């Protein structure tokens, strides 16, 4: 659908937003916890992607409540965004099979 | 659809390509960073799959920008490829339920 392709692009954008929110907020939330690793924006941003794709290589994670609260948002966003894309591929194909026969 | 099955196979191929790009490039990008582990093609290729399926056992990861930039591409490819397959299963079933009633 024109809707499904719109929704897909929009998710992509929002994800990038969240990732960027993700890093700023992660750093902002973990500075003050001794032993926190998640305390510079560029590594917060690496951390944000591997969280959002649910790769979790485990090089980096939050140790504080708001670290983990943020991380949850980022996870959820990520998983949503990629699902919507898959749905938007599903709708395109279904559409193209509909007309195929009628 | 004939389209959805075409698209599925094509993703499969591209993924294999990316995996292979993935390894060559990972090795090419991490040799020169002391302590990098991701510096031989065969282990770059193990690394490339667990990244692309988002298993991340965490035995292996990149430590450099282009390591991580490459890794992102590989993630994204992986997640896309398997989504398209699921979509291409969704279209097949929808099609087979359509005719079932009409």
């Amino acid at each position, epitope marked *: 659908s024109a809707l499904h392709w719109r929704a897909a692009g929009a998710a992509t954008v929002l994800l990038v937003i969240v990732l960027l929110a993700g890093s700023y907020l992660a750093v902002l939330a973990e500075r003050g916890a*001794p*032993g926190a690793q998640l*305390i*510079t924006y560029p590594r917060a941003l690496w951390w944000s992607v591997e969280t959002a794709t649910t790769v979790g290589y485990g090089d980096l994670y939050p140790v504080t409540l708001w670290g983990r609260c943020v991380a949850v948002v980022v996870m959820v966003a990520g998983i949503t965004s990629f699902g919507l894309v898959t749905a938007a591929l599903a709708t395109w194909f279904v559409g193209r099979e509909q007309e195929r026969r009628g | 659809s004939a389209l959805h099955w075409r698209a599925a196979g094509a993703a499969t191929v591209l993924l294999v390509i990316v995996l292979l790009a993935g390894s060559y490039l990972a090795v090419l990008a991490e040799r020169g960073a002391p*302590g990098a582990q991701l510096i031989t093609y065969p282990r770059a290729l193990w690394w490339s799959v667990e990244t692309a399926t988002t298993v991340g056992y965490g035995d292996l990861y990149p*430590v450099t920008l282009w390591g991580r930039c490459v890794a992102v591409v590989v993630m994204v490819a992986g997640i896309t490829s398997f989504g398209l397959v699921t979509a291409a299963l969704a279209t097949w079933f929808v099609g087979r339920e359509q005719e079932r009633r009409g």
Partner: antibody
Amino acid sequence: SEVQLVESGGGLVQPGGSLRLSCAASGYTFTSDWIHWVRQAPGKGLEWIGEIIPSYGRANYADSVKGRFTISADTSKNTAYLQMNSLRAEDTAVYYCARERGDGYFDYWGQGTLVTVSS
Amino acid sequence: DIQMTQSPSSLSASVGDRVTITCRASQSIGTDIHWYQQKPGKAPKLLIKYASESISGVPSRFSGSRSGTDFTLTISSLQPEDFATYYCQQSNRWPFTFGQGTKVEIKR
């Protein structure tokens, strides 16, 4: 240099007294920048002491500084401050403020000011 | 808290000579070390970032290197101007901490 951090405040304080130091921007500063405070007791190393993002205005501190000291910021003036209470002789040192972009290093520092603690 | 430990704690090399300053991290910190030069009475000046990355305006005699827990600032050809105390500093783990300092006296 450019984005010169100027420092204000600094002098003699009574053991247990209060002194408000100051750090002014005087340059282009991203909204996300942290201002840090860094100590050097006479003939000794540098000691990290505290950070603030002037914008969200949340501040963190080293154990040595505890809740004796409070870091504040006036975003209207582009002037971040350090409020010192409890002052021991330990606290006798030069205090440098310094800018960090959130990467984890200090590109521009302040001229530094002595705080001397003596009855 | 991550202990940066510099080496030696002071140096007198002849000008033109090759001088190296070790700084051992107490745990792996990646490459999140940065070197500063402090001339007597002045504010510290950043020399190297991220282990090797060089700063705009710093001379070429200054190079940071090394991995493992070990990190090394090298002044290729010691100058008279290089009379300073040099500090390493970690960004790996909160809070940021500094090394004890290494003081370079010129010999002549």
